[PDB]
Symmetry: D4
Subunit: 215 residues, 8 copies
Amino acid sequence: KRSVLCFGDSLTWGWIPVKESSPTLRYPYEQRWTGAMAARLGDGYHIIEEGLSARTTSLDDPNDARLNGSTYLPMALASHLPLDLVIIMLGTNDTKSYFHRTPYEIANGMGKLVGQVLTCAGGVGTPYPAPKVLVVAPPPLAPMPDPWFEGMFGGGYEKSKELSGLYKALADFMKVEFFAAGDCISTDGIDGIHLSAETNIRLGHAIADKVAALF
Amino acid sequence: KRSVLCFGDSLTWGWIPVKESSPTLRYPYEQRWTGAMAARLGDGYHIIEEGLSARTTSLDDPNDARLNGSTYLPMALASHLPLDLVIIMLGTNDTKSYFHRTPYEIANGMGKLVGQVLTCAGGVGTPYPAPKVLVVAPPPLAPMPDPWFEGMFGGGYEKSKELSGLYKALADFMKVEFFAAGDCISTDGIDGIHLSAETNIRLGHAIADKVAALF
Amino acid sequence: KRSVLCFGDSLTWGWIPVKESSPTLRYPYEQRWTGAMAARLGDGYHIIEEGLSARTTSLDDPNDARLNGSTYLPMALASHLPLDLVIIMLGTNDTKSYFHRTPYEIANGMGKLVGQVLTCAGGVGTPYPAPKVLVVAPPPLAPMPDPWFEGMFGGGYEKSKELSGLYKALADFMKVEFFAAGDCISTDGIDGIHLSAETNIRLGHAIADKVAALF
Amino acid sequence: KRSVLCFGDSLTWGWIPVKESSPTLRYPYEQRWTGAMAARLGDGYHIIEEGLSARTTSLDDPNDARLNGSTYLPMALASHLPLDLVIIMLGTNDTKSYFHRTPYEIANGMGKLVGQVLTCAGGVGTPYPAPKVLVVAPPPLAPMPDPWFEGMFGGGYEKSKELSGLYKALADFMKVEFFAAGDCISTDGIDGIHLSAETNIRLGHAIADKVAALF
Amino acid sequence: KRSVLCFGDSLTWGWIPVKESSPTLRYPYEQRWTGAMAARLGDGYHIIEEGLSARTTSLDDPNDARLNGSTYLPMALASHLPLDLVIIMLGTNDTKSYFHRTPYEIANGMGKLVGQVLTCAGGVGTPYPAPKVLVVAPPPLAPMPDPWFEGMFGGGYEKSKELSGLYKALADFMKVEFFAAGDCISTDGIDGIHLSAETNIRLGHAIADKVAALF
Amino acid sequence: KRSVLCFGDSLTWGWIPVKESSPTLRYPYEQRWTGAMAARLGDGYHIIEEGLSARTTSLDDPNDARLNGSTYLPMALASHLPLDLVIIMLGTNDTKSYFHRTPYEIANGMGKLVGQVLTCAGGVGTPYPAPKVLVVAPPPLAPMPDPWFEGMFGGGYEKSKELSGLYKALADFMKVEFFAAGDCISTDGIDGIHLSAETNIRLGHAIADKVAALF
Amino acid sequence: KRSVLCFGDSLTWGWIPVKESSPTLRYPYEQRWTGAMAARLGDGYHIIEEGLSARTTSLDDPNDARLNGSTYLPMALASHLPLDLVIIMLGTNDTKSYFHRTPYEIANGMGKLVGQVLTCAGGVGTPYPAPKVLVVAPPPLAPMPDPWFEGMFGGGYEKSKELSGLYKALADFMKVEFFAAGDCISTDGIDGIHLSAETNIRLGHAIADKVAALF
Amino acid sequence: KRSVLCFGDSLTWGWIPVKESSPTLRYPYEQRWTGAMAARLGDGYHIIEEGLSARTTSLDDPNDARLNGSTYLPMALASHLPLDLVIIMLGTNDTKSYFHRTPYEIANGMGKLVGQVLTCAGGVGTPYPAPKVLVVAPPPLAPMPDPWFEGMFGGGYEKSKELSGLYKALADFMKVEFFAAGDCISTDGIDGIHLSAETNIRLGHAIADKVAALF
């Protein structure tokens, strides 16, 4: 059996876009991209979900101590070995206005996460090798009707558009795999940030085909 | 389905005891207590595994920044809501010689984790409620033929015999559920620390019976 | 009775504007907005005052470790449960020149405080629920004849004009209550920052009307 | 009018002792020692309550960031100036097993708090003088029927018996006022830690007589 | 007798300007402003020198842990009580290119130091009162022939010109004394930063007049 | 002139022992050991006083951030170069009950300070060499009639008796100078900690004789 | 023999420029500038290599805790005394996009390292003197065909052109030696960052000529 | 060619024992164990010396920030790749009186260093594999004539005697190589801590045999 760890933010947790913006409920597994990917990959794969709303690549959020992805990823890797592949879809939250990050710095944060996977061989007391890495660039942001979300992501749209190219450059440099979500889907939720079930399913099917071919 | 997050150390990850002590392989899912519990609970339950070898309740390990359970649990809870129950089986590693913790301090560390579950309602932007908690006392340690493990757990056996009584008192105080694993299993692995497959399966079946009676 | 905690800066503490700028005396209770609110609400309400001159939403002041509102609020909430409502009037001091904060960052700091209220249920060992929240936008700044105050608030007037709209958006997003003080009062003190007794009393009466309609 | 700040733990917050140990409700104001003291002092005094369950003199609690009294007292003083007197009743929680503090270290923590009052003149931008200080030694602990509380306070009884003498020595040295609660009341709650309403009322009346005579 | 603490940077230590820029020797006491001030004041005054080359008001220097004035001043005050007056001449080093401080932030750092004096009453275990404060704005910088010093103070000249006005506003606001060194002297050393002996003597005489007028 | 920096605690600052223990006044210069030493050395020497009540060698005091000698000494050395000699009389406060330091640890803290002197050559931008070092063991403690001082120094008398032998061994190892004050004076103040004026003067005269023999 | 410590980044470690950018192999010693220098200096000299890919002067890299040169240099100096000369070639990595450092700040970081060498006399328990220092400006950057390297060094080329002039000014100020590598070599590797073997050898020969002229 | 990194304390740096204890000179390379090992191994081996007097396995020394071995080892590994073998001889300094470490904690600190080698594959941007590890238990301490050294190592002899057995157990557990220096040499220097030249040579020859047998 092959084990695949899916590390992400609200797009991976499965945030349902809603007209009142927040709070919201979670998509059932079969309507998450992770579940749709698992269905297409089949029973030879075991999918592990680690999606956290508002998670960044490598930034401490001023209002929530839980959100730095790089703080949690080493622990998660060691908890889930043996792993064949880690899929990482993050970066959208790094584009928020109050973080003042350049696109390159966001990609460099993704690079920190890739390095944490590449150096994780052995975990705590095992002979297991490092898994492969699939870097996923999230789809670009869209216009947002809610003024709080619009303020939250001020300046972020242009940054989100640059991530695909920079993540491709990063993945080539670090000799790992790459997939641009925006080549297959768009951000289609009413809030301009999150995704519909149908788009989650299309995304998971497409990632499944990438996974099946990358080993 | 009812979601059950299983938070623990190597006993939960599934460390196979071996003659060379370390390193070792992972039990397959159906030979882990988590998988055996999942099998007896049936398809109305969804099990989430968060087991990490060498994890403590609330201590920083001097050689490994991944191992403080309380550093990770809030992030894990928010990543996995909605949750109906969190089962926590930890404390054995707090008995290691170099931590110099009293049994009450170990139970108080378990209490820190219980509190993190009880106050987690809402996660990141959801209306979901806090789950129930099942505190599990691990079975006492056993003779260790490897001198490195014997030094690692110097003074720990006597502390391990006190955890069950103190965890019961904690659980009554905090108004959560409690299971004494040592009434049903013993630490039967060749290394004096870990468990056989047959014992994992017995444990998981016993925990499943306890969980079913809560719902 | 219904308990109302009033969390704020000098506008809440009751700084009397004076020709020498500083130091100054405190308005008596019946000339504070808190006391005037208490008088119009009547004996079914119990007011708790937590006003601190120079307090910010969520910033460490370089000269004074007492001034980060978010450092203190969780302790204050647990000390005063049971609470029915928390009124927060802060943000003016975040506009000071040496903080270099954008208006969105100031509102996001207010959001940190709102979240601290919303997640405070139980306090230390109680069954009490989280109180409601009333976010109050302070009135915009005014001309400052003292050159030290003018330097202190350089760039702050323009930011102060944006807080009301952003606080309304925050409150709608977090599903709490909102009052724009600038619809009812102006910053009428001689120093361009603080308020007259007549204006405090008008503010408190207006807030009282808002509070009564919540219960 | 004279203003009196009452800084304390669950004995000041007003924890009702209950057979299930925890959680519990709060005494109404007239059944707290603060309220009973205010009734006896009369309308020439304004009492300010700052009681926090589980609060220590100057220790960080491993499971709760809210509980170090010395972290909060400077902020509270500046928020409540002008003050004529600060009454401090703390130390019981410093005797808990997991803190491993000697009686002298507990008294030295009380001394830290006394110094914070004595040096607080001016607050933020006022001409107000430092208030007087009344150090109150809490009554000694009693036997505890609940095993979690008994473990929590292991070794604490003897420490609690030494605080009166050491706090008297401290108050004489620092030239402030002293009152031994144990000379008037005993710890009479079922849990061995907290107080009955009748004892709260006796205590507040006795502190009121001390206050009226100390200026 | 009355004691006067002189807290400063190289202008107070007595750096002799030299063509090679650095290193250099110290002026003898009678050619320092402190010694010249002491001579004019007479033997009714005890002068304490605390001058440190490269010292800032309140900034940590990246290359030298000794240079934050506000880190050392509280210790120095307590070491030198009883004190009648503290003279503070700092701010020039805050204008260095790599600190990126605005003039207001520099004056606010001076304000931090003024506050440390005003709150220092008692020291460690004494009845002594807080000293008075004389804020001294240093003379503006001059053109600098050495390229390393020119880079070191890039952007600093304009900032140094603004300190007099801002320090005057600060001293009025905090109700302390003020003296503009630039009303009496100029920066006349060959390096564009430090002062000649005759200028130190003129400066010390003028400061002595200010000190004598206060007492 | 030869410059001599005197770095110490209350014995150097000049704490007057008094019947009420604290607070107290400072001995005049002529009644300090520093001033008595200066008089006997004469006008070829320049004495710099750096005495701070309650100062330790290298410990952070829980109640006062001013008191770690090793935190302040590097800044003080650079402020006072050129220096021919640093006299260090510290260690008594390290024997306080709440520090739990062994006598060797106290001498090792003295060693930290000696090293700071030996490595201080050049200061900030000077060619000056490192000064010589005179390590002074303070006299042992004596009976303490005040219960607060008795508790403060519990266990400390026996440690104070060992400092001289250990400081001699330190000074020989580090190749610096050593004077045992306890051969010439005893702790004669009423409080069992501090010194009479007559004893200060005898100490300073004895240290002066030692200093002169070094040059 | 005369001992020469060579402290640097990938230019010193010997990164082989390659078409796929990363990862890469290390030049053999004979193809490193260090080994080429050693050969030309001959057997009267002993070369110590301390080159680390990605090392900065004095910056913490967000992704790698190994890379701050100033964190490691004091330990390295004490490990290798006696030393006659330290050659430092660093600064290129400080020009990376995500550090946002000005050229003067980069030279000031070099200055931090120079100071660490100049103040290292004695090491741990030795009489050895501080070595001489040779500051080496690296050659300017060149076109970078890999998009990841291009982003990594955005803004850096222009900064790299200013380092030589600033390092010369630093070395004159601090009274140490200076060599401009860009007078003798250019950045000739395919990646626009690293060097060919022929260029390493030419550099080492030119540095050897400089070193010999110092002794 | 194969590269061998020698990571150690004064026994590796080459401290010459001397009657005055300290300071002292360094043995020439051919009288160090490293140089003697290199001579026996031949020119197919490249030896890298990283010895630092007073270095510990994993402890911060109170008086010197340079001495934690585990702080420096990751940087040194990355600087010296490609490496075939890392030889680690440390632990003697962890036995010093003021560290209060148990023998197991010392061996666990060695374990931290072993783990840093085993996880170092790649360094910064290379394909190189992790080196092998040779753990060397240092020879036990001897009686020490100097009282400062005797105090420094109080309690340490017994601890030093236990390191061989514990390091053997550690090396077996971690599956690396082990050599007991005390099976071949004794601590023969006059100070009871360091070694003679002939003993360094015998030690290096015996370690070379171990190294050659591995390859």
